[PDB]
From a paper:
Colony collapse disorder (CCD) is a multi‐faceted syndrome decimating bee populations worldwide, and a group of viruses of the widely distributed Dicistroviridae family have been identified as a causing agent of CCD. This family of viruses employs non‐coding RNA sequences, called internal ribosomal entry sites (IRESs), to precisely exploit the host machinery for viral protein production. The IAPV‐IRES found in the intergenic region of the IAPV virus belongs to the well‐characterized type IV family of viral IRESs. IRES sequences from this group dispense with all canonical initiation factors and are able to assemble by themselves an elongation competent ribosome, successfully redirecting the cellular machinery for viral protein production by an RNA‐only mechanism. Using cryo‐EM, we comprehensively characterized how the intergenic IRES of IAPV, a virus of the Dicistrovirideae family and a causing agent of the colony collapse disorder (CCD), binds and manipulates ribosomes to redirect them toward the production of viral proteins.
The binary IAPV‐IRES/80S complex populates three major conformations, with limited differences between them. Class 1 is unrotated, while classes 2 and 3 exhibit a small rotational movement of the 40S. No populations with wide rotations of the small subunit were identified in our large 80S/IAPV‐IRES dataset. This suggests that, in contrast with Cripavirus IRESs (Fernandez et al, 2014; Koh et al, 2014), the IAPV‐IRES is able to restrict the dynamics of the small subunit, channeling it toward a canonical, non‐rotated configuration. In such position, the PKI of the IAPV‐IRES establishes a network of interactions with both the large and the small subunits, effectively restricting the rotation of the 40S. Apart from the interactions established by the apical loop of the SL‐III with ribosomal protein uL16, the decoding event elicited by the placement of the PKI in the decoding center allows the establishment of an interaction with the 28S rRNA base A3760 (A1913 in E. coli), normally involved in decoding (Demeshkina et al, 2010). This interaction is maintained along the small fluctuations of the 40S, which, locally, are restricted to displacements of a few Angströms. The limited dynamics of 40S subunit rotation observed in our large cryo‐EM dataset reflects a solid anchoring of both ribosomal subunits, mediated mainly by the additional contacts contributed by the SL‐III characteristic of Aparavirus IRESs.
Numbering used by the authors:
A (entry chain Y): 2 to 72
B (entry chain b): 2 to 99
C (entry chain D): 58 to 278
D (entry chain B): 2 to 218
E (entry chain An): 1 to 25
F (entry chain W): 1 to 83
G (entry chain X): 2 to 130
H (entry chain S): 2 to 133
Amino acid sequence: GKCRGLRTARKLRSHRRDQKWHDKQYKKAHLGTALKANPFGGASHAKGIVLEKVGVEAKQPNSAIRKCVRV
Amino acid sequence: TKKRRNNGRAKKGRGHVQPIRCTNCACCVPKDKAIKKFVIRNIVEAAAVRDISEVSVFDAYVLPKLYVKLHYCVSCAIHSKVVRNRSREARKDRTPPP
Amino acid sequence: KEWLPVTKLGRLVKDMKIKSLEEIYLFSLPIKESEIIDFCLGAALKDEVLKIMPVQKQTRAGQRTRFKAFVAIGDYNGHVGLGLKCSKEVATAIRGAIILAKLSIVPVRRGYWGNKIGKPHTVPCKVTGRCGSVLVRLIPAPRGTGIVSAPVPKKLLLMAGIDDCYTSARGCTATLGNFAKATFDAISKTYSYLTPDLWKETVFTKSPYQEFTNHLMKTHT
Amino acid sequence: SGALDVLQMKEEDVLKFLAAGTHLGGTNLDFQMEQYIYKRKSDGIYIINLKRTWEKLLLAARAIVAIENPADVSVISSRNTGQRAVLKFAAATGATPIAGRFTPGTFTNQIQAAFREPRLLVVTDPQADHQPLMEASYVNLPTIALCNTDSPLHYVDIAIPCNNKGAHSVGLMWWMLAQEVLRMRGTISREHPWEVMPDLYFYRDPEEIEKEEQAAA
Amino acid sequence: MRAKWRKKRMRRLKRKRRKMRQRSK
Amino acid sequence: MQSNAGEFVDLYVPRKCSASNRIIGAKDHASIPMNVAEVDKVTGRFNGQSKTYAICGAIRRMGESDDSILRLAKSHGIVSQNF
Amino acid sequence: VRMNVLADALKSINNAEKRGKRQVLIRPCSKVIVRFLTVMMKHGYIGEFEIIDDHRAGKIVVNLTGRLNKCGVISPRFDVQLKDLEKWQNNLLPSRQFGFIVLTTSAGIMDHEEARRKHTGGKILGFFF
Amino acid sequence: GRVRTKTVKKAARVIIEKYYTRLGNDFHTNKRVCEEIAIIPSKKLRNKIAGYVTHLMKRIQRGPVRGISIKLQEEERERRDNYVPEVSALDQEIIEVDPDTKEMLKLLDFGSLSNLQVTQPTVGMNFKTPRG
RNA sequence: CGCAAGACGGACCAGAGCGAAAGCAUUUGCCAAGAAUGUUUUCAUUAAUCAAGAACGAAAGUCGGAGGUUCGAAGACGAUCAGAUACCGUCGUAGUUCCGACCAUAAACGAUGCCGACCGGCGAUGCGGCGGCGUUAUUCCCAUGACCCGCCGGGCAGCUUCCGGGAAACCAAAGUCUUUGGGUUCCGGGGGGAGUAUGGUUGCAAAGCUGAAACUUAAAGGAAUUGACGGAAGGGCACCACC
């Protein structure tokens, strides 16, 4: 900490509370924007319908077809 | 990184200095920043002081010198070999070489 | 197998006349012979190589791959050293680092947590030691705690003879050069820390050079 | 050295100090050397206090006599002004000389043949002999220094404030230091002033050697 | 791309968005 | 340095700087127990006994080892009080 | 400005230890400083001092040994109970063998091992080991 | 072209260190010395050694050489052990003493001696080499 | 040779000063201001730092009025080139100059918040003060100036070093730090997306201030080292180099 005064509890608490938003993983779990745009909506599993089977091209030096499924 | 302890210049407690127009270029270099030579020189270099004294009117008339102060920018001092890339230790030497 | 010594200290260590290396450590004499530590701490002293680290300098055409060897050393009651040797073959780097560990071995001071019962088992106080960004705090723990630390300083503290110890390392500890020397700098500052137990004055006993100067003038040239 | 009239500042030694110019020091003063100088003259010369010049040479001469083997006192000069003086002091006291070219790593490197391992150093100038002071920081070597008014006290343990710049005020301060050490071992008695003349301890100018032959032809 | 001209191309691009929001307002 | 029986347990008691009271490290190689001679009151010669001083590494490279010797020898009555 | 007189006066005598001054001077004199130094002196980390009266805040020349490793100050003055005195001494001091947190109590300024005897908590001043 | 290599110059500085007594000025005599006092496996290299030996040997006829240390240079140190001058430069009866050096001796025991000349101060105190 | 104009204030000019910063250099007069030093004056804690709120703020740019010598975005042309709608040349619009309102940003940098303490040395300088031989002008003496030897305080710097620190470069601060706390304000949390979208607010406008996310990615990055390379500066050498 910086300000160490004995009656500086509300500043030291409130300054953290503001600067904790600048933490990436805090703002992913305290703004509901990630929880909104999470395709499962906060589930570990989800049932869906296979509408097309699509073979994805592997990225850098690894040259291969990654056989995925659009659900 | 910070290559020099001064900022390749001679302001330390100013904030601002007047810009100089360079002699080779017309660059706007700060005055303290700019490489300066007060060139004092005879009107002829070596080979002509013989003959111009021979056909002179007055008996042993000393000729006038040519007092011009040059202001070189960093680019036109190193191109015309006025200043030069010294070693990372020997840069610090602020001794005008004889 | 002889070791006919070179330095003035090494002469008396061959003679069986200076019987403790605690007499060497008292006068801060530079041990610069390999076989001074091989003499006293001969049959107890355990060598473990921390890591073989292949270093490279990019030259005109191709790289020169040399091999850095970090050797932790120490008998399991008091003495430890951390030697580093860079060589072109690994088997000489491992060989050369075990020697360079010995020249720079220190005694660890060991004290007590709370009650002062039996033999000492922990660091006498809290000592920090560092090189680079790696800061290694040593903390005295109660009996039967063990070395609560990373695998690496545990390997130097199991060799120190310190049974029970806490740590709180801080920095790029992944680099084993800075991390082994930080924890080594800590266990060297255990005896260089003036506790209120040691206010009782230093009686200046005679140096091993001061006493046997009459031997130093009859044994060799 | 203190409150003994046996080792008190002798009357015949002050008349050597004034002629030699040991009092007559440098133009700049080192902050570490204020304690050894009475007063600064006009024309910038620091008057080195000749008791506190004397007093410091006694304690220096004590620490040499406290070495049981008189041969492991490494007596070093690099500059000409004390090249002879050290090589005579080494003969008088029985000490070890290196007069000119102090090889870096003599005290530190083992495999070097020139690996002497001394017990006390005597230095002609802490700057001229900067190198012996630093190899004195790697192996446990205490230091006597023939200090000047400006010469530093970095890695020197018993400073002797002297005019080691002057030609005839080096050998004169090796003369006091050679004498004092020899008496305390029980060789020279304070009855008779010493057989050796203080003019032996002077580096002779080769100009004044090709002059002395012409003068004394 | 210089960070000075990247800025200049964002300033022209923002200028074009005030231009095209006004077509609806 | 005692246990809880009172017996001395640590394997060596390191030296301590006579000038600054700071204990000399087992590898502080700029630290030196300088021996100063003792003079017989009227003979003016080495008694065979000495005066032994420890000045730690940091003081020599600070440049204060000879100011301290000049002050410590004064308390042992070597250098004249007046000085 | 000078807001903690005890903080400056202990830092001034901490720099003298780390440098190696044989005695040290501190400019303003709170009674808290003298009451701090008496606890330092009775444990015997420092030698005797004498205060220097000018009709102002007092000055103090403290005669140092080289025993004092660090002289600390805990600003702000945390009010401490007997249960919490263990937590303060188990991180701020080197071991459970030596080192002394002096903290002001209603029984006057005194060390932590005495606060366990007298059975009185209070506001933390600093430390020395 | 003719620059002596370290295998020539080191045989030059050990043969003179050991066998100074046997050598001389003449090349052809100490060409032949090098056969008895050394095992030189070449005809040519022996002459290269013995050539610069005679060069150094003509220099030890004069004075001190850098990389040589012999029993005769020990005898010079023994010869120069015993120089004796006439009564000293330090035993004068006119010795120049400043008033400020007269003041400090007056605070010593030796306030007024028999054999000193006191002076007057050099007023116009200019003792610094100017700036630039 | 004269003249009229509008700019600008060389050399003197400095690791010199002042100002809160931006900035500020012809002579004099005028009008307020200010530090530093001096102080055996006076009040007697009146203070430090500061959300909100505000003053000022280079250049460019905007609005109006005046002025337009030089320079000169845009633009006209001549070159250069494969091309140059670039560098280079000659012209020239806005502007550059001033007056009154706007704008509030710069690598606005010492890339280093401010107040305080403590912790080495060294030689300079700037301002005030104090004291000290002598040199010098007012000559007809004092006191002032000019120097000359120092000291104190304050300021801009400089050198030095195992103070110590740090990833190092470097730093008497960037030190007094796991031995972690003098006070306090702003502020950062992998690279991007992005200073973007959106909402407010400011402005005549250009734009400023506040300011995300979806997504994307395993590195981006700092200091240093070795090499290779250079349309960098040198120092060599060779009839597979020239002379």
